[PDB]
Amino acid sequence: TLNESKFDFGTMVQWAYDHKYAEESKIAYEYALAAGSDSNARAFLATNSQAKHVKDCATMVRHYLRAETQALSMPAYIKARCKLATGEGSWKSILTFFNYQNIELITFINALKLWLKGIPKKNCLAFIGPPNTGKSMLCNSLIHFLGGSVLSFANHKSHFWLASLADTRAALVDDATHACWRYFDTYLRNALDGYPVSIDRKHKAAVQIKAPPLLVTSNIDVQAEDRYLYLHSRVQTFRFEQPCTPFNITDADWKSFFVRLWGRLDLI
Amino acid sequence: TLNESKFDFGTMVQWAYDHKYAEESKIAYEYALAAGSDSNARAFLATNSQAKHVKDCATMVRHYLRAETQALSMPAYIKARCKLATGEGSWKSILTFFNYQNIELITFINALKLWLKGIPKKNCLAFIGPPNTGKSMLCNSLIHFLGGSVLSFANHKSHFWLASLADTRAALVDDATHACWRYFDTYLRNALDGYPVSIDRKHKAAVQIKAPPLLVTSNIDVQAEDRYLYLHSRVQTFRFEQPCTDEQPFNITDADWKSFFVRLWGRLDLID
Amino acid sequence: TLNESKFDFGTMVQWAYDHKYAEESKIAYEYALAAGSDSNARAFLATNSQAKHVKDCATMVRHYLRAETQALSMPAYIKARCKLATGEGSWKSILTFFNYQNIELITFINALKLWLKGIPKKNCLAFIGPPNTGKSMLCNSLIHFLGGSVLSFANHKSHFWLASLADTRAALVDDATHACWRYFDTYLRNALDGYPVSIDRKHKAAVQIKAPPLLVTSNIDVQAEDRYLYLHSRVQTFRFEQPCTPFNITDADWKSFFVRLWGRLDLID
Amino acid sequence: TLNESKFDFGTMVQWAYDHKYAEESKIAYEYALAAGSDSNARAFLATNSQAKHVKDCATMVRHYLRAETQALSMPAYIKARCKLATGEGSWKSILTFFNYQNIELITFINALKLWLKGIPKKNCLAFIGPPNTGKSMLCNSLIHFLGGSVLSFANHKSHFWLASLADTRAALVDDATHACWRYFDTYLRNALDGYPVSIDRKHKAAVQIKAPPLLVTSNIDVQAEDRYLYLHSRVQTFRFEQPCTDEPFNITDADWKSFFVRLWGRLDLI
Amino acid sequence: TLNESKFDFGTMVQWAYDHKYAEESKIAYEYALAAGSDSNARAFLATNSQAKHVKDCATMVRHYLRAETQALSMPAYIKARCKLATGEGSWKSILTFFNYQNIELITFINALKLWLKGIPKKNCLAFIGPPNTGKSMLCNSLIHFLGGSVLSFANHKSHFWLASLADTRAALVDDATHACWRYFDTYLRNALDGYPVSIDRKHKAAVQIKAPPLLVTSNIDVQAEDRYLYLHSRVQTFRFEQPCPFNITDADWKSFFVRLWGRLDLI
Amino acid sequence: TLNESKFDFGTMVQWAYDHKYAEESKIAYEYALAAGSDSNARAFLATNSQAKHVKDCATMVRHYLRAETQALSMPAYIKARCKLATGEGSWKSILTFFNYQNIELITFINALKLWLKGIPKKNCLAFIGPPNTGKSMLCNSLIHFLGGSVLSFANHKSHFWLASLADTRAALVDDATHACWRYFDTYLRNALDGYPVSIDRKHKAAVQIKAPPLLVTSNIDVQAEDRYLYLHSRVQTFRFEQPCTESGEQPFNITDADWKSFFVRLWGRLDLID
Ligand SMILES: [Mg+2]
Ligand SMILES: [Mg+2]
Ligand SMILES: [Mg+2]
Fold first, then answer.
1. Which of D83, D114, E43, F64 has minimal CB crowding within 10 Å?
2. Would you say C39 and B1 are in contact if contact means Cβ atoms under 8 Å apart?
3. What are the SF3 helicase domain coordinates in residue numbering (chain C)?
């Protein structure tokens, strides 16, 4: 690598935006590479304030990306996500899986249609069963397709562990333990309902925002438990009982899924 | 988007304020687009300190907006909130819902009249019942119409969670648990009395303001419990016992409140 | 509002000080208005670092205002609280309330006189009686008039609860629970006796100071309970027996009270 | 407080130091008043970066006061505190009290002597007795004269409650409870033996220091208690039994000044 | 050292990067030394802003270093790690040791092949047994060879104790006590699984990132414990029963990977 | 003082480094004193950003001091520590003491030789016995000589209470209570082993570093206790049974010069050679 040797900020931002580079380290490094055949990248390594520029660039790209994502309605967004996916794919992969778990695909379609609209008390789908039934498998593939974020309950003692909810269009909590379910029960009923919530962000002001659609995987059946009574109404449960690993849903599978079931998932 | 090829900050703030953009994300993006015509927006994209300008702009805007909003009387405010509410709607759906819960709309009206003026011991309305009775949905629709804020007891361990009581004209604590009621019982006593309290910040300023009218929803009946005796006379309870467990469930909207308020403006002592 | 179009900061601060604006948002807004008729306010809107100037102006103002009030004598401070409070006012309001709860006015005037002077053992007046006898009512009204602060002792979690004491001329402990009294009994004798106490604050250094005068409200009669023997000589109880559900004390009432009884409260400056 | 109509920071810091103002709001307000008859104070209000200077200034003065207090030997330090002592009392006021509490001046003078040097196991003087025997009275008067600091065991749940030990030359832990004494036993053995303790400070990294001289008051006799065996050889105790109660004793700063000026020899402060 | 005496930042960074100096103190000091025979190092000591240059340099180097590590495939990465190792070595050292613990090397090769790919439920290998059975010994040597990071559960009450997971290609938790296993069970199943995980960085904002392969050493057999039921499926256990001290070097691992390249599916 | 009245930062740092002043208040005050006969110190008092320069100076010094301490090997480091010690001394002071505690000096030498190399499971020496047996006495004198740091278990609820491990070459925990041993057992086995650990530092970034050699003094005998089973293999215990005081005198007191004598004499057997 070379980092040695008039700089325009905007151009670097343009570049960063185009390549979807949102991360300070990647932006810095990847631009320093562009330096061999880019006079602006060359100029960037000539400035003594490159550190700040990398920082401001990431801020700037984050601003734009966030703003784009927020502007789109769910259909237009899924549309963009479909455009993004590549590879061989079939909704039949998804069908087969649900059929393997002895679930009619329509049951999922119905729930998914409403989940996507973020309708109160329907804003949370939970995939529940004994280990190795493709729960994490499925939810992760979908969250990936959608460009959703994973929430890490491991960081719940922090104020900003929910900060991504100010940006993403769907979110996942993977392997909700009893501690996890209780926290949700106590503090995050409104977020599970998909009502507005005050979201704390690092260098920014708090935003009040509709908590986006939620996914949860767990071994714990909330509907069956009396002590999670108040969650019964806001959580739709899909029970995955059958063992699997082979079964492997790609992005292209979801692309196929949404394209096939566009009308049937009500996406006007 | 295009973010490339002297700047005046005040001009950007003017634009942002007029368009009422107070989020950096939006200010950043939207101004970048306005670069084709408006050539201050063009100057903006040629500065190496774009990021700061966005930051500062959001600050500057939300300063002004907060400041006009405090300057308004509750009447004049609700007015702006009606002016802001769009779509087709009717107060009948509010009537329908209370009557559904076997409550006369006039019981609600009375309470609301006093609650809007923030009268001592009338400052907090609670909607209490078993799960699925329209508590959250009623309150949220109101708070939404009112432009109020939703406090999250999740962050309660840091007093900073009440920061927004400094800014907004009404607040909701959605789904109060015992823990949360106990919190009211020790701290927010003064809020339920009209005597000012001290609100803190991450950007530490440490002001003192009269507390905005509160809404609470809860599965816990406070009037029924002695460990919450103080709150009995200071919290007005509306018991919702009828469930709505059966495509889109029932929904109150901005327009529904808009008409509710235009129709009942008189009876609500909002006259000026 | 107009926010568009050489700037002198001190001038802005001067202005802000004059209008008593300590409020970033208010400052920002009000200056931008007073601007088609102030060369400096206009100049402010020309500057790119407006956001900084507002922040600094606030800081600067809250410094001056804070420091100017910290420097007053107790009498001078009350004279300030008197100027600051306006409205429909009579002390007759208070006198009848005391008469309703069967407390002689002079008992209270005296006690207050010595309380405002923060003499040890005279430093803490408790108001005691069963729920709903206007204890909060009265104390809040007084502390408000005086611009003091309100403290709630929760339990353990209340670690920083005394943090405001670092700063106010007076304070009120709202509904002292039994544990709150034990806290006094255990950790606060020095405060009551006129000695320095370390007061922990959030994200700044602890401070050592003489405890401001304290009002307390409680259902617990510390004079009666021998397990608080040590507070008996340090706390002066006013017993409120009569339930009230009309009475309402105001900033304007206290004003009249203080102006009327000025000579009798020994505030002679 | 007129604020309107080339600034040297030095001149300001100086002014703040001279007047021993360490606290921003005071510094700001007080300098603004000086501006009537002070060119640099006048130049200050002409600056756009006033807030920055007021901050810096506080930080600057805080640095100096803190570091000069640390730099002086215990005798020179006491010497300084004698110069600060205003009014006029007498060392006799102090002697009279000890006479009343039936304790030996000589015992005290020695204890204090060694306590002042912070000699291992001589570093902590307990003042023990039932309530209202003038324990707080005497200890606080001594701390005051000394420029000491009070530690509140109330704040012990934060470990920052000891922060001031990285600063004072003498410290008082008032009204020790059992909780507190076994705290000492548990955590502070090194403070008593004159070995190093890591004292955590809030906004900056912890420092290792030798704990300055310590006073304690308490209703609890550590020497008479078995669970504090370690403490017996490290804590020098004095029992006060005598009431101090009229709706009579008030040791002043001048009292202490006279005490030290007069027993200077006997305290080994040469 | 000498600290007194036109500065170019980029050259300093270049330098720091070349020497792989990533931390402020080292950078500052080591550069101040270069000052005798480097005009840019000389010019650095002439600036009144050297403090922030050292700071920014560190920032800039970790940007680059992180970015170049993240860019490499696991094969390409191990390749570079092999290039880095020096000295005398043999995979036999490793074979001998697994054989000593009565474990066929192929069992380990199979597990490692998958672990390196970060396959779900296969992302975590645990070395388990009574004290002094070369558990920490082996895991540490591997983590060293790989340039992986240590996690310190001692800091688990902080938000940033997992912050290295945003940078390393492999991680180790050494001596998981019961408290440690429980924390993992409660909060980090997905991390163990090697699914995407939101990782809180100190002054930057969080990143969503796939969790690197994991090594744990412990006296606690999770597989045998009913209360760690939910960990059974995501943790492959290697039981080290035999005591010992013997040592595995970088060059041993270099030998190991080179020899077993194809058998490890490193194309 | 006089705090009043062009500046070169490097020179102030040079100064601060030379005087090994690393701590902001000392740096500011001490330099303000140098102002009488130093034009750079005089210029410092003329700038408006003194507060910052003091701040940056401390940063810079800390950088240099840490960096130079980490660069040295253990031998070269002890070497520099010997150079630093002054006064009358003899290793016999040390011998006499161990002999007084009925311990052969060679037992300690053997342990120390390995402890200094920071060999796994040998990275921690605990001195254990009833009160007043010179445990803290000895450990502190050694830590002092080595320029090691003391960890204070009073601060253990903070992330940063271990922050010194990123800097010192030896470290001591004095008077380990039961709470203390348990914390070590639960959270800190591998640091007791002297394996790489992630040490969190306050304002800066966490650092991954080899945990330095450890000393512990305690009234609690971990080897005898079944509940500290897993500490048995990583802690070498020296039992001090004999009193080191009556509260007349205190006969045993090891100086820096005693250790200087100790290491110089026993350089070979501690394998601190080429
Ligand atoms: Mg799973
Ligand atoms: Mg609800
Ligand atoms: Mg191990």
1. D83
2. no
3. 103-247
Question: Looking at the complex, does the CB of residue B174 fall below 8 Å from at least one CB of chain A?
Answer: yes
Domain's final residue, options F19, F52, F72: F72
Helix/strand number for chain B, H first, E second: 10, 7
Q: Which two tokens stand for residue B260?
A: 């509710």
Q: Which residue of F has its CA nearest to E149?
A: F208
Residue C12 touches chain D, beta carbons under 8 Å = no
Q: Quote the CA–CA distance of F224 and F218 in Å, as a whole number.
A: 13
User: B63 and B126, same structural domain?
Assistant: no
Phi then psi dihedrals of residue B78, to 5 deg: -50, -35
- 8 Å CB contact of E163 and F206: yes
Interface test with C, best of B11, B12, B14 (most C CBs within 10 A): B14
Contact C205, C185 (CB under 8 A): no
Q: Do C131 and B230 touch (CB under 8 A)?
A: yes
Question: To one decimal place, what's the resolution in Å?
Answer: 19.0
Looking at the fold, whether F133 and F29 belong to one and the same domain comes out as no
Alpha-carbon torsion angle F38, F40, F44, F47, nearest 10: 130
CB atoms within 10 A of CB C139: 24
Distance from C-alpha of F76 to C-alpha of D25, rounded to nearest angstrom: 52
- Contacting residues for A117 by C-beta, under 8 A, at least 6 apart: A74, A266
Q: What angle do CA D166, D169, D172 make, to 5 degrees?
A: 90
Q: Which of these three, B72, B87, B108, is where a domain ends?
A: B72
**Nearest-CB residue to F60 (from E30, E51, E158):** E51
Q: Which helix (H) or strand (E) holds A128?
A: strand A124-128
- Subunits adjacent to chain A (3 or more Cβ pairs under 8 Å): B, E
Q: Say yes or no for a CB contact (<8 Å) between D70 and F25.
A: yes
Q: Per DSSP, what are the bridge partners of residue A267?
A: none
D154 in C contact zone (CB under 8 Å) = yes
How many domains are contained in chain E? Answer: 2
Report the SS3 class of residue E103.
Answer: coil
Does A198 lie in the same domain as A97? yes
Q: Backbone phi, then psi, for B108, in 5-degree steps?
A: -65, -45
Cβ–Cβ gap A189/B174 under 8 Å: yes
Nearest to C235 by CA among C213, C257, C251: C213
Q: B186 to chain C: which residues are within 8 Å by CB?
A: 152, 154
Q: Does C32 touch chain B (CB under 8 A)?
A: yes
Span from the CA of E227 to the centroid of ligand 1 (angstroms): 17
| CATH number of the domain encompassing residue A200 | 3.40.50.300
Percent helix, percent strand, percent coil in chain A, to nearest 5: 50, 10, 40
Same domain, B27 and B98: no
Diameter over CA atoms, chain E: 67
Produce one character per residue of F144-177: b if its CB has 16 or more CB atoms within 10 Å, e if not. Answer: bbbebbbbbbbbbebbbbbbbbbbbbbbbbbbbb
Alpha-carbon distance of C187 to B167, in angstroms, equals 37
Kind of pairing between the strands at D207-210 and D196-199: antiparallel
Q: Compute the distance from residue C181 Cα to the ligand 1 centre, in Å.
A: 52
d(CA B92, CA B70): 31
In sequence order, which residues have a C-beta less than 8 Å from that of residue A263 and are 6 or more positions away? none
Q: Which ligand is nearest to the CA of E129?
A: 3
Q: What are phi and psi of F38, to 5 degrees?
A: -150, 115
- Asked whether the beta carbons of residue C48 and residue B189 sit closer than 8 angstroms, the reply is no
E161 contacts in F (CB within 8 Å)?
198, 200, 206
| CATH number of B30's domain | 1.10.10.510
Please tell me whether residues E115 and E201 are part of one structural domain. Answer: yes
Is residue A2 within 8 A of residue A35, CB to CB? The reply is yes
Domain limits for position F51: 1-72
Does residue B126 sit in the same domain as residue B3? no
Q: Do residue B46 and residue B177 come from a single domain?
A: no
Experimental method: cryo-EM
Using a CB–CB cutoff of 8 Å, tell me whether C5 touches chain B.
yes
